[PDB]
Amino acid sequence: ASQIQFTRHASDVLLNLNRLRSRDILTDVVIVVSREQFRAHKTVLMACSGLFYSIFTDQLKRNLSVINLDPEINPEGFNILLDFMYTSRLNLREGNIMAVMATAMYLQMEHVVDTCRKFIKA
Amino acid sequence: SQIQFTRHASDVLLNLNRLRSRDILTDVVIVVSREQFRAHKTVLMACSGLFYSIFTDQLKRNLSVINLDPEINPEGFNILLDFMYTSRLNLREGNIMAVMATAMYLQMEHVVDTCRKFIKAS
Ligand SMILES: CO[C@H]1/C=C/O[C@@]2(C)Oc3c(C)c(O)c4c(c3C2=O)C2=NC3(CCN(CC(C)C)CC3)NC2=C(NC(=O)/C(C)=C\C=C\[C@H](C)[C@H](O)[C@@H](C)[C@@H](O)[C@@H](C)[C@H](OC(C)=O)[C@@H]1C)C4=O
Numbered sequence: 210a211s212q213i214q215f216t217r218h219a220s221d222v223l224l225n226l227n228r229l230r231s232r233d234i235l236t237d238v239v240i241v242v243s244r245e246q247f248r249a250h251k252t253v254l255m256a257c258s259g260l261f262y263s264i265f266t267d268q269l270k271r272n273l274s275v276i277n278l279d280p281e282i283n284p285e286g287f288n289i290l291l292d293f294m295y296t297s298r299l300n301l302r303e304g305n306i307m308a309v310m311a312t313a314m315y316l317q318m319e320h321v322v323d324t325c326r327k328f329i330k331a
Numbered sequence: 332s333q334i335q336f337t338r339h340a341s342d343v344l345l346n347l348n349r350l351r352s353r354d355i356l357t358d359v360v361i362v363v364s365r366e367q368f369r370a371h372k373t374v375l376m377a378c379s380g381l382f383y384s385i386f387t388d389q390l391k392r393n394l395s396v397i398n399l400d401p402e403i404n405p406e407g408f409n410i411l412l413d414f415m416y417t418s419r420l421n422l423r424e425g426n427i428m429a430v431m432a433t434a435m436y437l438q439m440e441h442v443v444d445t446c447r448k449f450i451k452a453s
Contacts, residue, residue: 211422212419213445219341221377250373251356252371298332
């Protein structure tokens with residue numbers, strides 16, 4: 210009896226999820242940041258973000274197809290964090306470092322916060 | 332941005348598996364013989380060519396129940412489902428032929444290749 214672990218499977222799935230997202234397949238939510246719209250899978254959001262996890266665990270909010278993020282959240286930093294959720298890659302530049310950390314703190318992605326803090330420190 | 336955080340994909344899959352066991356946002360029942368397996372369509376689709384084709388056909392895309400072909404055995408399907416959500420494929424001499432046959436059906440060819448090696452080791 211063997212329990213075989215496939216070590217790039219998790220990477221393969223997340224990659225596929227991203228492919229479904231870029232074709233807009235089975236995306237079941239629109240996140241509204243200021244007034245820009247991002248389509249996403251609820252399940253991915255919850256799997257990465259303490260905020261979205263909190264929200265969608267509420268059996269009431271669970272079938273909401275629209276979510277209005279707080280208005281201090283800028284769309285640029287959100288889009289970067291959405292890309293990270295889906296790619297495990299974080300586009301960090303001096304120009305965006307601050308908007309990314311604030312958005313991450315807000316989404317409760319604390320490992321993203323702490324790599325932003327590590328970045329800050331050239 | 333050159334750096335990827337490979338464990339992230341693993342966190343993501345770990346949390347999707349959590350949602351599944353809590354039955355949060357599961358949106359399909361897969362029916363295998365007379366056995367029901369709750370799941371998320373996105374995850375099935377990201378893991379199986381067959382599921383990708385089913386959930387991408389508009390006549391099938393919007394049903395909460397999907398029946399697999401009658402020949403498919405429930406023990407085999409349960410192992411593949413666990414694999415999709417954990418990356419671990421649990422093979423036993425008691426389950427192997429049905430896992431192979433079920434993985435072939437689901438067009439999961441790397442899992443098929445690993446079953447053949449186990450039978451050769453057995
Ligand atoms: C890593 O990704 C692979 C599958 C993952 O696994 C699955 C389970 O998750 C998927 C995800 C998340 C997807 O988004 C698609 C598919 C699958 C899976 O199957 C597809 N699967 C088929 C569905 C069933 N058969 C086809 C047959 C029955 C007609 C197999 C593929 N088509 C598929 C699609 N779209 C298309 O075909 C279209 C509109 C265009 C394709 C253009 C080129 C030709 C490709 O892009 C090529 C350069 C390469 O990228 C793919 C061929 C790649 O294959 C690999 C590993 O080289 C898959 C996308 C998809 O968008």
